[PDB]
Amino acid sequence: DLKGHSVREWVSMAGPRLEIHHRFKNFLRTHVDSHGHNVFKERISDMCKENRESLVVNYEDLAAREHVLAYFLPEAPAELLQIFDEAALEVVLAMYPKYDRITNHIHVRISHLPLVEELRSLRQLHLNQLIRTSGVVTSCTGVLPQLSMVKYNCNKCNFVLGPFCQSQNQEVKPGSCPECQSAGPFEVNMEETIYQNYQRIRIQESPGKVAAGRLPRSKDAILLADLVDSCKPGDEIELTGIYHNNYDGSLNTANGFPVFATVILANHVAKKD
Amino acid sequence: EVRDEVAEKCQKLFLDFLEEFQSSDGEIKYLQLAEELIRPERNTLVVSFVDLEQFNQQLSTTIQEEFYRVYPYLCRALKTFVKDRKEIPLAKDFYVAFQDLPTRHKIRELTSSRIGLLTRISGQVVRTHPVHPELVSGTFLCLDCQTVIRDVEQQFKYTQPNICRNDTNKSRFVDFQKVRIQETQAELPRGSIPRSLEVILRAEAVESAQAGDKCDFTGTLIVVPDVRDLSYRLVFLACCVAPTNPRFGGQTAESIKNQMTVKEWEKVFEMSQDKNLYHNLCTSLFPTIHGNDEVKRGVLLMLFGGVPKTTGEGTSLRGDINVCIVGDPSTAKSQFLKHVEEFSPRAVYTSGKASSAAGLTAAVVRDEESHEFVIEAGALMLADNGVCCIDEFDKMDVRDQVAIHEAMEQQTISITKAGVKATLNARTSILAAANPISGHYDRSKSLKQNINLSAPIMSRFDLFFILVDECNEVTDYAIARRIVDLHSRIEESIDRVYSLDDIRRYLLFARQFKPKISKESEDFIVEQYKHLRQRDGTKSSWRITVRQLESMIRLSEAMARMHCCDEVQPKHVKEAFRLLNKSIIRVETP
DNA sequence: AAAAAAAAAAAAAAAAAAAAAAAAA
DNA sequence: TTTTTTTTTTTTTTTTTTTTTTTTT
Ligand SMILES: Nc1ncnc2c1ncn2[C@@H]1O[C@H](COP(=O)(O)OP(=O)(O)O)[C@@H](O)[C@H]1O
Ligand SMILES: [Mg+2]
Ligand SMILES: [Zn+2]
Ligand SMILES: [Zn+2]
């Protein structure tokens, strides 16, 4: 389906968006196996049975059955992965209509990505792409609760405000409340807000892989709401994620250069043991 | 729209040079070099300044005296040179890397008169910060009128548009690494601390410099700002980085072989087939040190080393041999250490009490430009895959000796400091020089008593060399003759069969070999170890244990590596056994 | 009794978390 | 007038050096 001007903009359009949506649904339904008839059938069955709200998807089979979608995947991971989540949600509901009461969302994890790089080989060219690396977890914070669907509370008229979905790039700023049209301070409403687990880890190059006259490099990664606790310090892990850059990271502060910090939005974690 | 006519003319001439310059063969060499510019991870073309001088002298002079104000135009010329030939991405950018600048300048010479113009300097890399994406020109949105101010050029500072004309996904980024260097020893003026100016590296040449390397940086000195105040700091922006003293004129054995030239490989292969290469290397590496053949052989085997291995259970078999030298003063111990340091690359020399724990193993600081932390490499780390020469070892504090013991034990340093943990690798051999307790070696005691080293430290020293100053007249006459001949004829009087550069190249090539151990060699090792244990059945300077079998295996491996052999013949085992047996000295007593 | 090694004091530097004020529009 | 970025201040901790103390010949 190579056509247009920009890959991310190409998926942005509603047309190809729905085309990919239905093609991925048909791939989930139809891709069976060499012999393991409809691997995704029992996959979804087990995930719903244990309430795992996740789906590990091999890249090899997805590329084989739908090469266009696999090609589009790494270029613009955010949009393709969101579409895959949307597709898998209704696929699960079709298989398990009652499971809709559980998490109202499904995450898609991608594994066995073909090209695997090293933390020292990361460059600006890899910005905003699905990338697979390997490393040792050198630090990992607690399971911090991050805002997911905030409902700020207007102080003046005590009216709770609608769900302002939290973005991993920018902090959500409420407008003026619809009722009393006040742009006041507002405060979170924890009782009515819903959150998501937020863990932050650091992944460093395996010492056995570093060269002689070089030091190991490290990159910060964010695990979100299902990959949390999947790692502990000292683990050798293969991490596939988005080399995200545009959240707030830009050393605009004085005595600073226009550098950009980088964090890997984790999408799949595999402990090698 | 005023046009910088000088810059435009420079661009035109540079493009003409790019599309016209021909090599000796007569082909457009830079066209061939650009052929590879299409592939991603490749956006820099290295252009030798000698070629630029040869083609258009006036253009070269203009570039040298106006490097900064024309560099963007040179990049544009390269982009035009490549675009019209192939189908490179439109948004992809390209950079011009210069090298072989005939003249070099000292860090002390970087006066303001050199700002914004081409120059090459030499320095020693102290530490390299991580690699980041850098914004050169992107997009800006006005929050007052939503008028998008587009492609505002950042000058080493977050520069919003100064006035409204009335994002990331649509911006161009370049790799950026701030690596700190410092002045070389030769350039240091009398009684002055070294100068450090943080050089800045960009795409392609963004990791060509590592901590501890001697590197030549070619580029431009620039000023960075650190009613408003104009506080400026000098900073070097390098378009290319190369080793100051290249090892090869042209990592696996074949890769190193191809890295070399034809003549270098001829030399290396010739010396590999050179019978008696052992003695030739010993003499050439230490021409001014009389006698002490055993110590020379030990340090040579140390420079080569053994073969590291990993056990099925994960246990690590040490494959790098350490050496210690103990004896009376003026036995040329510190001279051995200095020889090894000055000769071997990645060789770091220290003192007894002059180094603290952090500066001797590692330290952590926080990157001044991002949220990540960088690791200041201590002396042990700079010796990674090299050698660390610790003179006056016995004087070293215990708080540091524990770290050295850790490095010898597991080859690694574990740090938990300043908000970051890390397990870093230190594959270093240790050449120690320790004075005997009381300042003189007493022959009527075991080695354990003659020195103030803790038992764990001595345990993992493969070789101990004792240099007693027997007051023999023949030896004194020989030593005096050699020293006086040295001081009479300074430059000459040293006829070393192989130049230090040749030995460096041969060492780098041979280090890649991983000799095996044949069954015959295994049986020979077993018999030799049996005999060496029977030796301890008069008393020796120190007991003989299985660690001596490990040392013998490692020494045989190093001996095999010396001749670039692929299997450890029995002769290597015999030589290692003989050397280790000589290292053991009888504890004579009335 | 005097020297060598260890421990504690103490002073300077860094992180940082939060409250208040001055400058900007 | 109202925001915002800085300014401070107020705690706390950390690291280097020096000094003081303890153990051994
Ligand atoms: N066998 C020898 N051959 C040549 N020079 C020697 C020899 N022994 C001692 N010297 C000279 O004695 C000087 C002092 O030796 P040095 O290594 O400082 O003693 P130490 O080992 O106590 O530090 C050196 O400069 C060295 O040139
Ligand atoms: Mg000495
Ligand atoms: Zn309101
Ligand atoms: Zn405006």
From B133, B368, B421, residue closest to A127, measured CB to CB: B133
Q: What is the dihedral of CA B275, B279, B283, B286, to 10 degrees?
A: 130
In DSSP notation, B269-331 reads HHHHT-TTHHHHHHHHH-SSS-S-HHHHHHHHHHHH----EE-TTS-EE--S--EEEEESSSS
Amino acid identity, position B508: L
Which helix (H) or strand (E) segment is B259 a member of? helix B253-259
| Residue A273 sits at the chain B interface (C-beta within 8 Å) | no
Q: CB of B136 within 8 A of CB of B95?
A: no
Q: Is B28 exposed, middle or buried (0-12, 13-18, 19+ CB in 10 A)?
A: middle
Is the minimum distance from the CB of B440 to ligand 1 under 6 angstroms? no
CA-based torsion, B130, B131, B133, B135: positive or negative: positive
Backbone dihedral region for residue A234 (phi beyond 0: left; psi -120 to 50: alpha; all else: beta): left
For B225, counting Cβ atoms within 10 Å of its Cβ (0-12 exposed, 13-18 middle, 19+ buried), the class is middle
CB-based contact B530:B437 (threshold 8 Å):
no
Cα B133–chain centre separation: 27
State which amino acid sits at residue A209: K
> In angstroms, what is the resolution?
3.4
- Please, which residues have CB within 8 angstroms of residue B414's CB and are 6 or more apart in sequence? B421, B422, B423, B424
Structure tokens at B236: 């070097």
Q: Write the DSSP string, chain A.
A: ---SS-HHHHHHSHHHHHHHHHHHHHHHHH---SSSTTHHHHHHHHHHHHT--EEEEEHHHHHHH-HHHHHHHHHSHHHHHHHHHHHHHHHHHHH-GGGGGSTT--EEEEE--S-B--GGG--GGGTTSEEEEEEEEEEE---EEEEEEE--B-TTT--BPPPEEPPSSS-------TTT------B--TTT-EEEEEEEEEEE--TTTS-TT----EEEEEEESSSTTS--TT-EEEEEEEEE--SS----SSS--SB---EEEEEEEEE--
Instruction: Please give the structure tokens belonging to residue A116.
Output: 């695997």
Query: Which ranges of B377-490 does DSSP label H, i.e. alpha helix?
Result: 379-382, 398-410, 447-450, 455-459, 473-488
Q: How would DSSP label each residue in B572-590?
A: HHHHHHHHHHHHS-B----
Q: What are phi and psi of B571, to 5 degrees?
A: -65, -40
Distance between Cα B335 and ligand 1 center (Å): 6
Q: How far apart are CA B43 and CA B203, in angstroms?
A: 7
Q: What whole-number distance in Å separates Cα of residue B509 and Cα of residue B379?
A: 25
CA distances from B287 to B281, B345, B408, B468 (A): 10, 19, 30, 21
Inter-residue contact B185 to B145 (CB < 8 Å): no
Closest ligand, as measured to the CA of A152: 3
**3-class DSSP state for residue B33?**
helix
Task: Single out the residue of A51, A31, A50 nearest to residue A41, CA to CA.
Answer: A31
Query: Which of B342, B470, B483 to mutate to test ligand 1, by most ligand atoms within 8 A of the CB atom?
Result: B483
| A263-271 and A218-224 beta bridge pairing | parallel
Going by C-alpha positions, the residue among B354, B447, B337 that lies closest to residue B396 is B354
Say how far apart CA A143 and CA A199 lie, in whole Å. Answer: 5
Q: Could B131 and A220 be called an inter-chain contact, meaning their C-beta atoms sit closer than 8 Å?
A: no
- Paired strand residues for B466: B326
Nearest Cα residue to atom 17 of ligand 1: B332
Q: In CATH, what number does B5-97 get?
A: 3.30.1640.10
Distances (CA, A) of A203 to A134, A216, A237, A272: 8, 10, 8, 14
- Helix, strand or coil for residue B493? coil
Please state the atom number of ligand 1 nearest to the C-alpha of residue B329: 22
CA distance B314 to B194: 44
Q: Within 10 Å of residue B269's Cβ, how many Cβ atoms?
A: 14
How is residue B168 written in tokens?
């990331």
Inter-residue contact B424 to B381 (CB < 8 Å): yes
Nearest to B364 by CA among B379, B380, B376, B372: B376
Rounded distance, CA B344 to CA B334, Å? Answer: 15
Which chain B residue is nearest to residue A7, measuring alpha carbons? B169
CA B503 / ligand 4 centre spacing (Å): 67
| Eight-class DSSP state of B540 | B
* CA distances for A17 relative to A31, A79, B47, B345, angstroms: 21, 9, 46, 57
DSSP B129: P
Report in angstroms the alpha-carbon separations of B517 from B463, B484, B553, B558: 21, 46, 9, 12
